[PDB]
């Protein structure tokens, strides 16, 4: 493994405990790298996922402290709340490919904190339904993400409006 790690331009480490924890893919970003980076990331998805890594990194440190107890301040528990939803957001069911045009909204919702509004257990329901809502209403928006593959100010606003409208649901 050591020899190969040098040769390769990425690592996609899978954590066994996280598999059992039900995160599938069970990837851990701590041991997963892309040395070619976001030059291979589509422009829309690059924009939405900019701080997704940062949020997760903050979640990891905060979470470590939390296991060793001690009353966590509200700022840390904001992180904790955001982070928990993100973890559920990551989860997927094996043998279910997803269209990138419909992965861009879900990450937008999360990063723009709309999903912190929704209870952790039903996040999976929310994602599915959110897509259904976009399929019904902002299917024009979905078409644009497919067609233009970069989120303009107009797309960001449209997407924001769509998400806000569905936060209620």
């Amino acid at each position: 493994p050591t020899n190969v790690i040098s040769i390769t331009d990425g690592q996609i480490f899978l954590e066994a405990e996280l598999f059992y924890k039900g995160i599938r893919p069970a990837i851990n970003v701590g041991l997963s790298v892309s040395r070619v980076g976001s030059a291979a990331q589509v422009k829309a998805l690059k924009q939405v996922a900019g701080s997704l890594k940062l949020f997760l990194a903050q979640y990891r440190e905060v979470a470590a402290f939390a296991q060793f107890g001690s009353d966590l301040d509200a700022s840390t528990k904001q992180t904790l709340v955001r982070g928990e939803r993100l973890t559920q957001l990551l989860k997927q069911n094996q043998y279910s490919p997803l269209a990138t045009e419909e992965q861009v909204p879900l990450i937008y919702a999360g990063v723009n904190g709309h999903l912190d509004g929704i209870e952790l257990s039903r996040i999976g329901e929310f994602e599915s339904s959110f897509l259904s809502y976009l399929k019904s209403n902002h299917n024009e928006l979905l078409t644009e993400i497919r067609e233009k593959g970069e989120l303009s100010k107009e797309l960001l606003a449209s997407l924001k409006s769509a998400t806000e409208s569905f936060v209620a649901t």
Binding site: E17, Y20, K21, G22, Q67, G69, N93
Partner: protein, 116 residues
Amino acid sequence: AAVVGQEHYDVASKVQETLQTYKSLQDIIAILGMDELSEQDKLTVERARKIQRFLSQPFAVAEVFTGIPGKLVRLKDTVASFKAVLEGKYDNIPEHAFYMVGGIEDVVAKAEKLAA
């Protein structure tokens, strides 16, 4: 979720997650007591303690060696039994009740034995 069906898979999923948590906090439990864990988690831990005991099923032909008459439980019965336990339906009775017994019905009965 396809091969053995969604209900089975969901039931199994929760058991796996619960037990993995129980293993995860195993360190913390030793270092500081179970009453020094978070309340939400403490329910999970208590549930997991039941699940662990529940997994027993007296040997069906090494019944002699164990000294306890065997138990064989149907797969259909098993899914039902665990489903209930996950919903904490029968969680309210001793660890001993779930220990070295077969199906869910047996746990209930073994509570009656214990109650005496």
